[PDB]
Design a binder for this molecule. Structure first.
Ligand SMILES: COP(=O)(O)[C@](C)(O)c1sc(CCOP(=O)(O)OP(=O)(O)O)c(C)[n+]1Cc1cnc(C)nc1N
Ligand SMILES: COP(=O)(O)[C@](C)(O)c1sc(CCOP(=O)(O)OP(=O)(O)O)c(C)[n+]1Cc1cnc(C)nc1N
Ligand SMILES: [Mg+2]
Ligand SMILES: [Mg+2]
Lengths: 801, 801
């Protein structure tokens, strides 16, 4: 911790390069337009919401950056990647309007987007695909997202894929937001990886929403203490220019002592009072500090301002950051929340128009008019001139990449479509599939395999040799080993998965990890990734409740597919065989990185269990993509059922089919369900459309074009809801679903599959019971199966075990 | 960052209080048994798994704590709260066996728990309720959980509820695990709250699972740097006692220097070579260093050990931690992963036996025998004596609290059961219910309201005047204000929700926050809370996709219920009315904290929208708790349907019922569904039971007892699956479900409810559609309803919008 004053003394401060007077004029119009946008919205009385106090506190910080630092996307790179603090969006909209990028109508449609000519409350690429870039309103994600984005830019340079040396990643953070663990939890990575292309800008207004961040402490010193300790370059922007003479003339050092000892709570109390109060309670603390302003008026004392509101102090900080190498920089900008808003914290607008000398008549002021600068005016000219010098306007977003990739054909995965020699797992199939992609000229080096420590568990260790591990194992290494850090790996994945948009350089990441620690652990990032239109693959390894058998409660995943189906643009699959994994990976590659450029990302659960991998049935490709296909039908003259399975449990459902046929004379149609969720969505879309077009030919759910009406049983390694979700669309009156509801526990696969009532025995009993209800076999046969199979009909429901 | 030597020089090192040689005899048996447990499991060839290398590196650290520090649960307090690193569990089981707390048959069932006499892979209270206390195997949750547990202990002392001053919270962490953002992201909280009852014990073996944490750096210095920066007391336990004469003998300071410049990777390299390669590639760096070991044998060099393996060095650290006040302490213990396992990390077993002088003869070694110390032996005597002086054995867990609470009756919530004069929301209902609880003598001071910054948004402000904010606004304050930190808040909620077990002191937490930032953001902690048998309330405020209308994509929650239903022991509700909220909160209170002591926690989504709140219908209580009740029946002669709604959307389904009756003569039964998830679980249980008891009369799902066969339509503020999950159990041929699938966006509630196709007009069209299909009405009237209601039949599916 250093003294509570500016890091950069005035004698080391560079001359300000812009026109302060003209800049303030434009900045005041932006402040005004932002407040008009939100006030106009609130007048509608539709609970639209919106904030003003935060942007008022950081407007000058953004202004200096827009006028002198921010590079826009250009022909060479995506420009500076700015993670705009979410709730200051009105200020960004206000500037964009001023630059003629948005119409008044749009501002008048702030927070009213459904009908198409409105603006989102916050940065949401999915809602405004040509405008916003990084979803930041869920606090804490921006900081860690920014760290891994800066690290990815370095990666692209080190790998010789793109020169990104001219890009800087700015993460605009709140001080209260720094309390989210995700906020400082990975700051150490920036020092490890020497991220001198990263600048954290923390708006230290000392307040969060309902009160001070740490009233009895000094948040700025806390921030400086931990960032410095983590090895970052810390630049404090504490006091404005009026304080300089004061600090210089004070030979006693008491003013510094006084600033050091005063806590946040008191500094906040001062700004809520007046000049006389500050003279008595702050300077009045010591005779020497009292003497420094004895000859000042109370009004002159009240003029003293925080550093984050002084363009000269701000510039000094951003320029210094720009020259700092070998590590990242954090700028702690001291501001006043609700700056210039008066008592507020219908003439409160009058106060604001007076305070910022806004050019709005006391006559028109009732109309909450927006201010624009006409073409040819000083303001208009300067505004655009500064932006053109920095390559244009930002934020801006390109929705599709321009180059054409020569993707592998499904035939290139031919080896995986044949029966496999040895028993292997779908995870081994995944690695084999990746190897096929790594032989493809067009995308081999665009692939970004990502792992969170665990590689050996996934048989990925065979790649540490072939393509190497990134380590600026050298800087040309291709694999990203992020350690025990799922959120960090997900942030690398996200940066890679959106490179097609931000850098017009499509990269195809495959992040494989323990499925349990996917959506459950980084779900807020998975949602944000959907918002950011990520295109990549999330491979949930060691998946299935009963399949990662020895690991237990906190590892046995029988529900990640329930979490993943809540993300609209995530496409999820639970393949049982190697050929399915290949057809799915190929399809995903084609949809996301082929000419379609579909904005979706994939989720594929894979397994750590080896078993026989048969050849793909001729023509089953499309059915695998759609979510289901008939594997075979076994004959039997005593009855007929339908049996569905997915993932590791399918082979057990097939075992049940053979038992039903040979022991009971019951034939069956056996289906592999590669994606219950895609089938459910398809069924939902068909019935929605049918409800809306009552006079037309009703659409038939895909699952109904595959299944028939005989009694059906489904079993998977996931909770029942995974397979039950398609009930409405299954065309049979009986559809029984077995699943792994309940907490996991350690045991053999055999014991867990019996415990969770999903093994072949339970599928047979479920099928026989349906026949028995139809009077096709004696109920005693079902009772006898239960006993023969050692099934305990009265053990507690696994959900409650 | 200090020199790469012990923080506590030998001159300030207290005399070790124990019998080193005897403790080693005991420790060697624990080491042996842990290994035997894992090897015997491996022999079964059931992919059970388990670890050995990690515990071998930290065994002595734990051993010193078990002999001289760890306080067991006693009559005064719950003892020290030890968050044992998850994968060192075999060592804990080995010691417990040696203490006679576990049997040999239990060790032989390591990782086979289904049949009842086994041991979980890791610390899972849900699976071993009388043994484990804290779920730590999901890395990163242990450290932040421990920080807030330590804070909660202080809270209990300041509130005057329990004297926890003698309790220390120990978090045993791995160095690789420190990369999890949750691991270091909340550490400044320990400094703000002066948590001198918290000790972080980081096993710095320089390795994670697939390689070194940071081979090109020095993870110990990185850790010291940031913890020191966060205000913690850092104690580095670097070198064993053999280095003391050496470090002192060096006058050039070349050794200190040599130690400072060597990177993690080099150090790991050395421990795989031998004294030879060490006296040359480490000591043979500077003539002054290689000269210190001039008169030394390559064997005496190879003898130099890391501090984490020397009990004298370990004791000093823990003793210094125990004495420290005003801040938390972190101990960085330098160890060797796979310590003493030689060759590897019957020949390897022979090596272990010899290396640690294990009392196992050549004749018995092939049987992989466990060792025990007979009563009367020195080892047995010492083992138990040390533990008795420390109040007993740990870990151990008490599943139920002993005191009897006098809970408020449902009558005490009478005002909430009546028709409300003022239009209010379910969130206002929750705050009022809390207030009722706050007037109950027995539980008023056991309630723990928790907020993450936002209180004003939730109308929680009126409570500050009543009970205040915990702020050591004073240390008697009842409300926990955790700032912008949902994970921290969840950890405080967990600490409070499990106080009933940990301190035999029931505390009832109510954590209210934006629902979107619940399971989605802290889902891994929620799962873990289930494992920890948490009994508390999670209130997802501002819930529903269309109800928090202006906030948009990262705020509009139409899926938290899909995430919460994956947790077995979480009970979820989405009430529409104030009376339902009171009935739900009363029942949860009774279930969890009444005599039943059910191990579940509640999740209730509440709304920010005000509307008319009717009186609870006579006798609806049981239906409200079970999940559904028939609100009303509307007469009609043209047809009849059933309409279901929950949350804020029920109001609209009720309006659709009026329209159906007024404009189309269609009558209906209207049901409020307070919990689609509890109904689906009930349905699954009935079907599971019916399948398992084919000779019995089929049980009928509650929802089917309540409903009839008339065409049904359901609408909610969540994705369709929320209501579709009960499809199988709805006894009607048609069950259409409207829901809010798709990303949220900003707009008026009216525009979003139309966009997401869940408003009254869509319910009416859905119902007419079913009647037309049945022939009751003409399809043409369905078509005319669509145009009449300004419904765009061809707009894109909201899931895709
Ligand atoms: C819906 O509007 P809101 O509640 O005002 C909003 C914008 O959603 C905010 S703003 C806010 C306080 C921000 O305080 P900071 O000091 O970080 O920023 P500022 O002082 O405003 O510059 C919080 C906690 N949240 C809520 C919040 C909480 N948790 C997460 C993960 N994200 C949030 N964004
Ligand atoms: C299946 O067992 P496993 O992989 O050996 C296990 C126990 O599951 C572990 S152990 C482990 C490495 C531990 O490294 P540390 O340096 O922290 O500890 P140690 O060196 O062993 O003392 C990881 C990443 N995981 C996996 C892991 C990853 N991510 C989370 C959130 N939790 C985990 N626990
Ligand atoms: Mg702030
Ligand atoms: Mg380690």
């Amino acid at each position: 911790i250093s003294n509570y004053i500016n890091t950069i003394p005035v004698e080391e401060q560079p001359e300000y390069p812009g026109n302060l007077e003209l800049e303030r004029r434009i900045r005041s119009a932006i402040r005004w337009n932002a407040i008009m946008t939100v006030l106009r919205a609130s007048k509608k009385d539709l609970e639209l919401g919106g904030h003003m106090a935060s942007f008022q506190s950081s407007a000058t910080i953004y202004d200096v950056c827009f006028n002198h630092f921010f590079r826009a996307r250009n022909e060479q790179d995506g420009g500076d990647l700015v993670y705009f603090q979410g709730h200051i969006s009105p200020g960004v909209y206000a500037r964009a309007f001023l630059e003629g990028r948005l119409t008044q109508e749009q501002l008048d449609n702030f927070r009213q987007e459904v009908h198409g000519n409105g603006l989102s409350s916050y940065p949401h690429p999915k809602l405004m695909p040509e405008f916003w870039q990084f979803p930041t309103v869920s606090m804490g994600l921006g900081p860690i997202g920014a760290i891994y984005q800066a690290k990815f830019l370095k990666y692209l340079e080190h790998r010789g894929l793109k020169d990104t040396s001219k890009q800087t990643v700015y993460a605009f953070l709140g001080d209260g937001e720094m309390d989210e663990p995700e906020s400082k939890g990975a700051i150490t990575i920036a020092t490890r990886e020497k991220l001198d292309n990263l600048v954290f800008v923390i708006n230290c207004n000392l307040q969060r929403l309902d009160g001070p961040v740490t009233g009895n402490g000094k948040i700025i010193n806390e921030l400086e203490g931990i960032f410095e300790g983590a090895g970052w370059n810390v630049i404090k922007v504490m006091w404005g220019s009026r304080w300089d003479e004061l600090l210089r003339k004070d030979t006693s050092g008491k003013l510094i002592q006084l600033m050091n000892e005063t806590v946040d709570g008191d500094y906040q109390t001062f700004k809520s009072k007046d000049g006389a109060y500050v003279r008595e309670h702050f300077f009045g603390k010591y005779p020497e500090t009292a003497a420094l302003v004895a000859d000042w008026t109370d009004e002159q004392i009240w003029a003293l301002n925080r550093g984050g509101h002084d363009p000269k102090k701000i510039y000094a900080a951003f320029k210094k950051a720009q020259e700092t190498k070998g590590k990242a920089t954090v700028i702690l900008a001291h501001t006043i929340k609700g700056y210039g808003m008066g008592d507020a914290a219908m003439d409160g607008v009058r106060h604001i128009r007076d305070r910022f000398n806004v050019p709005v008549s006391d006559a028109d002021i009732e109309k909450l008019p927006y201010i624009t600068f006409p073409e040819g005016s000083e303001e208009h000219t300067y505004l655009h001139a500064q932006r053109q010098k920095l390559h244009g306007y930002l934020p801006s977003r390109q929705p599709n990449f321009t180059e054409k990739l020569e993707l592998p054909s499904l035939q290139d995965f031919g080896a995986l479509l044949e029966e496999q020699s040895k028993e292997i797992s779908t995870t081994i199939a995944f690695v084999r599939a990746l190897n096929v992609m790594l032989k493809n000229k067009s995308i081999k080096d665009r692939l970004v395999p990502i792992i969170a420590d665990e590689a050996r568990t996934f048989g990925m260790e065979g790649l540490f040799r072939q393509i190497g591990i990134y380590s600026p194992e050298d800087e040309k290494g291709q694999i990203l080993q992020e350690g025990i850090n799922e959120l960090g790996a997900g942030c690398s994945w996200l940066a890679a998965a959106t490179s097609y948009s931000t850098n017009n350089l499509p990269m195809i990441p495959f992040y494989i990890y323990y499925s349990m620690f996917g959506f459950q652990r980084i779900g807020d990032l998975c949602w944000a990734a959907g918002d950011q239109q990520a295109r990549g693959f999330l491979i949930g390894g060691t998946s299935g409740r009963t399949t990662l058998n020895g690991e237990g409660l906190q590892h046995e995943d029988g529900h990640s597919h329930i979490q993943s189906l809540t993300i609209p643009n995530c496409i999820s699959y639970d393949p049982a065989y190697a050929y399915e994994v290949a057809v799915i990976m190929h399809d995903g590659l084609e949809r996301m990185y082929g000419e379609k450029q579909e904005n979706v990302y994939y989720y594929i659960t894979t397994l750590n269990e080896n078993y026989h991998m048969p050849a793909m049935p001729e023509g089953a490709e499309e059915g695998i993509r759609k979510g289901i296909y008939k594997l075979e039908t076994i004959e039997g003259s005593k009855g007929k059922v339908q049996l569905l399975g997915s993932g590791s449990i399918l082979r057990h459902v097939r075992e049940a089919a053979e038992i039903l046929a040979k022991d009971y004379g019951v034939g069956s149609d056996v289906y592999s369900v590669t994606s219950f969720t895609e089938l459910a969505r398809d069924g939902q879309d068909c019935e929605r459309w049918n409800m809306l077009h009552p006079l037309e030919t009703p659409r038939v759910p895909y699952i109904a074009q595959v299944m028939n009406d005989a009694p059906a049983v489904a079993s998977t390694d996931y909770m029942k809801l995974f397979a039950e979700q398609v009930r409405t669309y299954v065309p049979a009156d009986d559809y029984r679903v077995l699943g792994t509801d309940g907490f996991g526990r350690s045991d053999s696969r055999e014991n867990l599959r019996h415990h969770f009532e999903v093994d072949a025995s339970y599928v047979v009993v479920a099928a026989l019971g349906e026949l028995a209800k139809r009077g096709e076999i004696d109920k005693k046969v079902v009772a006898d199966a239960i006993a023969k199979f050692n099934i305990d009909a009265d053990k507690v429901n696994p959900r409650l075990a």
